[PDB]
């Protein structure tokens, strides 16, 4: 009946927001990663790290506002407030991109907090911890994209900046530079994400159109009871429908719901792997057999060769402004350009 | 060829900056999340019907009258992971929610493609920010625009004889 | 010495076969191009 | 095309070996009942 058991008691009380031992890591960090983002997007510039404006105060809207990455000159510096780069000057810290690492690190520990939360609430309630497990897929995406990728690269400057349009810029970076659409790990991720949305809508509509008539009213929602032991739709009629429309259909309610867990969690895990390769510029950029034919045979053209021209346009036209620290200067006469445009 | 199509669409319509494509993403990320959430939550509350040496899936028999998970227990967990009232206790609202969210979002992204067919394009904030002298102060939108330009000037490199690609 | 009591049988049903084959065949068809390069 | 010659042995083994595995376990599942 000691102080630990007393504190456990108080943390684990049933209240509007459960707290738990995990709340101690989660809540400070989740609140700080979120305050960091709102703070920087409202007041903080990207002028000295990027040559960009990025706050409401500067005139950007919600689509263009962002907490941007530090200058490439910072390497992978932790940029601690109290560290050698900002030397405790909160103003200089902000201007060097110190809020990027703040958000990304407290965010990273908040995500751990949250997965432990799912572990803690599942143990205290007596369910199996498959929600926690499913959340491993968000974590792997986060760590691979925001941490591992720029760690393989020259600096944090090349991670995603935290902002709507800024993430758009990152999608186009990966097309032009990594040819990421060609990469069989992104494609499996794509199949996973869309596979999931498909499973989401198809399972929701099937339940809603094989409902049992359990009440008299035209609004069929009123006639479910959370404690009823009776299935609220006919698995049997739903099976016959999909068998006859599609050829196969589910017969097992457990396999169905496990498959709904499996598909999206797996696709995200596959894409994470693909980004890890990209950390090292280990791309699926080219087909060698294509390049040898095309070099030798100037009448040979495919959609593969077409898209690498488009990548070539992207790299040359965006590099100087998107990487100011390289002082690129491409005189007009060297920019790749099709006829007239 | 799919990838060729989606690159060229961005150079010509700024589809990423278009709200209807943003809702399609919201529909399609949200769908995958709710697919995993619903699948993990039902899977978390299976009632014990098997031993350690067998697929729990054998705990359900096709056409059984009883439900095969405890939704009260699932509500009880997800309610506490967030708060009680952000979680469903009625299965009909829950499954209609799963249906509606990705369907609606994909109506919009399909409408986005349908309406960018008449060249009502995504938001353009190229040079929207300037200083007191009148210098351009770039944002991330202008960076996007540079990438977009590199696409514009290269696509169908031989097929344009005049300065504007008007279709 | 007694025969080992920890042995169990293994099962793969027919749906799981179809699912497995589909998975391998689609995987083969996605990667085949990269193997040929 | 000037393509990777192990591509063929690679694809065949990629396909065959997991498949034979699944089949072996299926057929002996049916032989029980």
């Amino acid at each position: 009946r000691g102080w630990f058991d007393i504190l456990d008691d108080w943390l684990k009380r049933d209240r509007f927001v459960f707290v738990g031992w995990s709340g101690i890591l989660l809540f400070p960090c989740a609140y700080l990663a979120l305050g960091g983002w709102l703070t920087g997007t409202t007041f903080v510039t990207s002028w000295y790290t990027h040559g960009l404006a990025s706050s409401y105060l500067e005139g950007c809207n919600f689509l263009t506002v962002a907490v941007s990455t530090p200058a490439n000159s910072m390497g992978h510096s932790l940029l601690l407030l109290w560290g050698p780069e900002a030397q405790g000057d909160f103003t200089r810290w902000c201007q060097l991109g110190g809020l990027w690492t703040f958000i990304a690190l407290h965010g990273a520990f908040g995500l751990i907090g949250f997965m432990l939360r799912q572990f803690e609430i599942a143990r205290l309630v007596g369910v199996r911890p498959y929600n926690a497990i499913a959340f491993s897929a968000p974590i792997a995406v986060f760590v691979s994209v925001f941490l591992i990728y720029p760690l393989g690269q020259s600096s944090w400057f090349f991670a995603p900046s935290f902002g709507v349009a800024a993430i758009f810029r990152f999608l186009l970076f990966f097309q032009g530079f990594h040819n990421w659409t060609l990469n069989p790990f992104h494609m499996m991720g794509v199949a996973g994400v869309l596979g999931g949305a498909l499973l989401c809508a198809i399972h929701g509509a099937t339940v809603e159109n094989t409902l049992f008539q359990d009440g008299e009213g035209a609004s069929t929602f009123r006639a479910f009871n959370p404690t009823q032991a009776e299935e609220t739709y006919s698995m049997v009629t739903a099976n016959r429908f999909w068998s006859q429309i599609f050829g196969i259909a589910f017969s097992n309610k457990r396999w169905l719901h496990f498959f709904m867990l499996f598909v999206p969690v797996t696709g995200l895990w596959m894409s994470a792997i693909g980004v890890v390769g990209l950390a090292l510029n280990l791309r699926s950029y080219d087909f060698i057999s294509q390049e040898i034919r095309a070099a030798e045979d100037p009448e040979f053209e495919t959609f593969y060769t077409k898209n690498l021209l488009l990548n070539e346009g992207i790299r040359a036209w965006m590099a100087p402004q998107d990487q100011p620290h390289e002082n690129f200067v491409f005189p007009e006469e060297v920019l790749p350009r099709g006829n007239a445009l | 060829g799919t990838f060729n199509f989606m690159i060229v669409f961005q150079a010509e319509h700024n589809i990423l900056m278009h709200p209807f494509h943003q809702l399609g993403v919201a529909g399609v990320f949200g769908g995958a999340l709710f697919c995993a959430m619903h699948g993990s939550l039902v899977t978390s509350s299976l009632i014990r019907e098997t031993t350690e040496t067998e697929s729990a899936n054998y705990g359900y028999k096709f056409g059984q009258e009883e439900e095969t998970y405890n939704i009260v227990a699932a509500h009880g967990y997800f309610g506490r992971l967030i708060f009680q009232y952000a979680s469903f206790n009625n299965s009909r609202s829950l499954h209609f929610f799963l249906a509606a969210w990705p369907v609606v979002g994909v109506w919009f992204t399909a409408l986005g493609i349908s309406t960018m067919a008449f060249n009502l394009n995504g938001f353009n904030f190229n040079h929207s920010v300037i200083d007191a002298k009148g210098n351009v102060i770039n944002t991330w939108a202008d960076i996007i625009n540079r990438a977009n330009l590199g696409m514009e000037v290269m696509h169908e490199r031989n097929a344009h004889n005049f300065p504007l690609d008007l279709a | 010495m007694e025969p080992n009591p920890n042995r169990q049988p293994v099962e793969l049903n027919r749906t799981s076969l179809y699912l497995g084959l589909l998975l391998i065949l689609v995987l083969a068809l996605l990667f085949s191009s990269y193997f040929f390069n | 095309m000037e393509v990777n010659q192990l591509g063929l042995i690679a694809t065949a083994l990629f396909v065959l070996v997991p498949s034979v595995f699944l089949i072996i376990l299926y057929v002996q599942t049916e032989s029980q009942q």
């Binding site: 049997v236 050829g247 | 096709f62 056409g63 | 589909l22 689609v26 068809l29 191009s33 040929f36 | 095309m1």
Partner: peptide, 30 residues
């Protein structure tokens, strides 16, 4: 031989389709 390999896999998937539908284990009630 690349062409042949691609078509053989595709062909096999179509035949698996065939067995998965007409030669499924049939679902049976209660």
């Amino acid at each position: 031989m690349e062409t042949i390999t691609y078509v053989f896999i595709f062909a096999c998937i179509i035949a698996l389709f065939f067995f998965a539908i007409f030669f499924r284990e049939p679902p049976r009630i209660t």
